[PDB]
Amino acid sequence: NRPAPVEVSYKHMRFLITHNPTNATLSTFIEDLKKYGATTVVRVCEVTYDKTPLEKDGITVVDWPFDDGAPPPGKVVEDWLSLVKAKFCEAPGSCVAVHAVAGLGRAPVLVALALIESGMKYEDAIQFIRQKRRGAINSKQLTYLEKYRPKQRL
Amino acid sequence: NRPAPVEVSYKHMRFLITHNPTNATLSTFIEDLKKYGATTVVRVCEVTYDKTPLEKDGITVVDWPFDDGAPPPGKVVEDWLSLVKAKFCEAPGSCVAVHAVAGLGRAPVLVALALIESGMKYEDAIQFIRQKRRGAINSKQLTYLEKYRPKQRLR
Amino acid sequence: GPLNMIQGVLELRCRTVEDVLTPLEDCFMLDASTVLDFGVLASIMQSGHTRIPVYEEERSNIVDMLYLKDLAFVDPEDCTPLSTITRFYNHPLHFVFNDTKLDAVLEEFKRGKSHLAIVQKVNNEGEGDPFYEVLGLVTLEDVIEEIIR
Amino acid sequence: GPLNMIQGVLELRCRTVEDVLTPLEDCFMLDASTVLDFGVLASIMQSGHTRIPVYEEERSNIVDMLYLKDLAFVDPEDCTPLSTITRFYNHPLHFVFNDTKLDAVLEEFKRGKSHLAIVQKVNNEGDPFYEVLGLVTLEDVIEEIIR
C-alpha cells in the first residue's frame, strides 16, 4: 500500500515524507533520498531495515520512535524542531526525510508542527499537508495539534 | 474496392452479380461461381481474363460487351432474356452470373429488366436490387429502365 | 462533462461515418508483400495499433486485418510475408458506408464485428458504372470520442 | 441505445470508481523482477493488454506501468528485467480514490493522464493507511455509458 515520497516545501524548508522501506526495496529508497537531496532520515517507527548502507552513502539516520498514531511526546517534538533548524542551518537547500510506517501519520504530524513552528497558521498547516497527501493525520494527532501552540522556534 | 458476389433470387430464377476479376484472383472467382452454382457467366465489360480455365471447369462464359454504364443495346437485351429462359429451363435450380467491371452498373441493370420481364413491378425491381447492392444503377440506365416495357417473355 | 456528452449521444443518430473517419492516407497500413524481420515487428509494436489493415498493390485495396495478438508466435527472422501470416488466420473485414449513422455503426461494433470498420461510397460522377470508393477507416474510439467530447 | 446511454452519462455523477473497478486479484500485472525472454513477451502479446501495472514483491505495490509500445526495441535475446525497462521511460502512475465521481475520473482521463488509474481507499478501522482495491480503466466508464 506504500505511497511514493512526497516533498513539502515551505520557508525554504524541505521535508520528504516517505514510507518505511524493506531491505529488498532499499536501493530505490536510498535513490529517491538522493534525488530529493535528503541527507538526514528521521525514522519514528519500529526498526525494520539496516541503517549502515545509508550512512555509508552519507545519510544520517535518526531513530526517535513513538507509537502507532500517538502524538509526539515532548522530548520528541523538541528534538525534532532543533534537529530541523540545525540541519537547515548547516546547508540551506537540503531535505529532511521523515517516515513512519506508510507516510500517512506520525511523520506528516512532525512536518505539520514544524510548519506551525515556522508561523504558518494551523489549519494552513493541515491545508498544505492534506492537499498533497489526502487524509494523512488521524484522530488524536490533530486534536493534539490544535492544542499545540508555537513559541515560533523556527 | 471490388465488392463480393451478391445473389438475387426471386421466381426461382437466380442471378449472381459479381466483379470483373483479374485472374491472379481467378481461382477464388471460379470458386464463388460454383459455390453459388453458376454454370454460365455473362460478361458485358472488356475482356481482361482468360475464360478457358472456366470452360474446362464446366462453366460457359458469354461475352456480350456494351459500353460503360450505357443501357443494354436492344440485341443484348433480347439475347439476355432468351439465354436466361433457356438456362433456367436446362436445369431449374442453377445460377446465371453476370458481371461488368464492379458489380454496380450494367450487370444489375440486366438482372433488373430480367426481373421486370418476369413481371415484378419496376419500383420493386430496383429497390430489390438496391437492397442488396447500394446505389446500383446510374441515372441514364434508370431513365432507360422504365420507358422499357415488358412483353411477358419470362414465364 | 455530461451536457456535452448527452448531446453527443443525441446526435449519434445524425452524424455520419464520413467526418469522424480517418481518411485513408493517414491510416497505419501494411503491404501484403512486406516481411516480418525484427524491424517491421518493432515498427508495429511502437505503432501502438493492435489492428492493422493489410492491403495488396494499392492502399485502397484492403485484403486482410493483421492483429497484434496474432504475431505472438511468428518468429521474425524466419522472415515470412504478411500475406501468409494473414492466411494463418482470416480475420473478417468489416465494411460500412459513409452515410451510415454513428449509432448504427455503434450497434454494428457492439457485438462481434471488428472495432475497425472500413468506409466505402458509391460514386456516380460521371457516367460509367458506379463504383465503390474507399475513403478510410473508422474505429469504435472515433465514436467514443464523439460522445466523451 | 440512446436513452440508456443518456442516463448512463448522467449517473456518471452518482457512481463511484468503487462500483466499476476491477479488484486487484483479477488484474493483469507483472513483478518487476520478471525478465524478457520470448515467452513473457508472447504472453504479453496475446494478453491483449497494452498497459500493464508493474509491482515489486507484493501486488498492492505498483511501481510503474509497462506500455506495449515500449517493448518495441527491447530485444528478448537479452534477458532484461522489467525493473530496468520501466524507467527507460518514465511512465505516469495515475492514482485515484474510491469515492471519486465517475465523471471526474473521466475528466481526468482525457486531461492527458494514463487511461489506467489505480484505486486507493483510506482505512481507519493506529495511523491511517492507503489501501489498494484495484484498477479502473477508461473503458470501464465507457461501457457504463454505452450500456
Q: Are B141 and B135 in contact (CB under 8 A)?
A: no
Rounded Cα–Cα distance for residues A16 and B119 (Å):
89
Contacts of B105 in chain C (CB under 8 A): 128-131
Rounded Cα–Cα distance for residues D71 and D66 (Å):
8
Domain that holds residue B118: 1-155
Q: Could you tell me which chains touch chain A, where touching means 3 or more CB pairs under 8 A?
A: D
Contacts of B2 in chain C (CB under 8 A): 132
Burial (CB count within 10 angstroms: exposed 0-12, middle 13-18, buried 19+), residue A152: exposed
Rounded Cα–Cα distance for residues B27 and B34 (Å):
11
Q: Are B1 and C134 in contact (CB under 8 A)?
A: yes
Mutation target to probe the A interface, by most A beta carbons within 10 A, among D55, D127, D131 is: D127
The end-to-end CA distance of chain B, in Å, is: 36
CB–CB contact C131 B138 (8 Å): no
Residues pairing with C116 in the sheet: C139
Mutation target to probe the D interface, by most D beta carbons within 10 A, among C4, C6, C85 is: C6
Rounded Cα–Cα distance for residues D24 and C19 (Å):
40
Residues pairing with B38 in the sheet: B95
Query: Nearest chain B Cα to C136, which residue?
Result: B1
CB–CB contact D122 A135 (8 Å): yes
Enter the C-alpha cell of residue D112.
Answer: 492527458
Neighbours of B98 (CB within 10 A): 28
Rounded Cα–Cα distance for residues A149 and A127 (Å):
17
- Using CB atoms, which residue from B1, B105, B138 is nearest to C60? B1
Full set of structural domains in chain C with CATH: 1-149 (3.10.580.10)
Total length of chain B: 155
Residues pairing with A6 in the sheet: A17
CA dihedral sign, ordered B36, B39, B45, B47: positive
Strand A95-99 and strand A38-43: pairing?
parallel
CA dihedral sign, ordered B78, B83, B84, B88: positive
Q: According to the 3-state scheme, what is the secondary structure of chain C?
A: CHHHHHHHHHHHHCCEHHHCCEEHHHCCCEECCCECCHHHHHHHHCCCCCEEEEECCCCCCEEEEEECHHHHCCCCCCCCEHHHHHHHCCCCCEEEECCCEHHHHHHHHCCCCCCEEEEEEEECCCCCCCEEEEEEEEEHHHHHHHHHC
> Could you give phi then psi for residue D103, rounded to 5 degrees?
-70, -30
Enter the C-alpha cell of residue D102.
Answer: 465517475
Residue A138's alpha-carbon distances to A97, B130, C129, D77, in angstroms, are: 20, 72, 78, 51
The resolution, in Å, is: 3.2
- D-C interface (Cβ pairs under 8 Å ≥ 3): yes
Rounded Cα–Cα distance for residues A12 and A17 (Å):
16
Q: Are B108 and B10 in contact (CB under 8 A)?
A: no
Q: Are C102 and C143 in contact (CB under 8 A)?
A: yes
Residue B12's alpha-carbon distances to B38, B116, D109, D137, in angstroms, are: 14, 14, 58, 54
Residue C25's alpha-carbon distances to C115, C135, D23, in angstroms, are: 19, 9, 41
Rounded Cα–Cα distance for residues A70 and A78 (Å):
16
CA distance C33 to chain D (A): 22
For the domain that residue B20 is a member of, what is the CATH number?
A: 3.90.190.10
CA proximity to A138, closest of A104, A88, A102: A104
Contacts of C133 in chain B (CB under 8 A): 1
Contacts of D127 in chain A (CB under 8 A): 68-69, 100-102, 104-106, 138
Residues in Cβ contact with A146 at an 8 Å cutoff, skipping those fewer than 6 apart: A122
Enter the C-alpha cell of residue B145.
Answer: 429502365
Experimental approach: X-ray
Number of domain units in chain B: 1
CA distance D33 to chain A (A): 12
CA proximity to A131, closest of A11, A2, A10: A10
